[model samples]
Target: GAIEVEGRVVEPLPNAMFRIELENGHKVLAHISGKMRQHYIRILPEDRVVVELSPYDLSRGRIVYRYK
Candidate 1:
């Protein structure tokens, strides 16, 4: 299970990864969910997104939604 966190896409990394900066001042590596990918939703820098993070590893997450 995971929890959702609000963040912005800070930068794009290799292999479709992104650097996300959360409101709480934590930086995590994130990737788009399969549904997002299938729908062709593009995540750009500075775009706000909802990230689903694992409790065991907050350093990474899956981008679940984009705010636009």
Candidate 2:
């Protein structure tokens, strides 16, 4: 199972990782999804993104969508 949430990219990290700040005041590490990378979607600081997290761990997620 997965949990979806919206957040803003706060920092870009090595190996395609990003620091995301959620509205609920939590920060999570996120990575681009396969489809996003395949489509060449680039995530920058301050960009809004949708993330999918595992039910068991909320500290990490996969970036699934970006907002313009």
Candidate 3:
């Protein structure tokens, strides 16, 4: 099962990756879907987002959606 968490983008990283400053205040690495990149759905520093912590690792997750 996956856990969804809300966070702010702390930094943009290389290769479509980013750092998430989770609501709980832990550091996390995040990546956007390749398809999202193609469509220009991207995240920027300080942007809020929803992420799914795919059951394997809690420290890294994928960016799900960016909200206003």
For each candidate in turn, give its C-alpha RMSD to the true structure in angstroms.
2.0, 2.0, 2.1
TM value for model 3: 0.83
* Candidate 3 C-alpha error for residue 25, in Å: 2.0
Q: Please, what's the RMSD in Å of model 2?
A: 2.0
lDDT of 1 by residue, 28-58 (tens): 9999999999999989999999999977799
Q: List the residue pairs that clash in candidate 2.
A: none
Error in Å for residue 38 of model 2: 0.5
Q: lDDT for each of the candidates?
A: 0.91, 0.90, 0.83
Q: Report the C-alpha lDDT of model 2 over 1-68, residue by residue, as the tens digit.
A: 23788999999999899999987778999999999999999899999999998567898989999998
Q: In candidate 1, which residue ranges exceed 4 Å CA deviation? A: none
Q: Provide the TM-score for each candidate, comma-separated.
A: 0.91, 0.91, 0.83
Q: Which run of 10 residues does model 3 get worst, by summed lDDT?
A: 33-42
Stronger candidate by TM-score (2 vs 3): 2
lDDT of 3 by residue, 12-34 (tens): 88977899988987778989766
* Candidate 2 weakest lDDT stretch, 10 residues: 1-10
What are the clashing pairs of model 3?
none
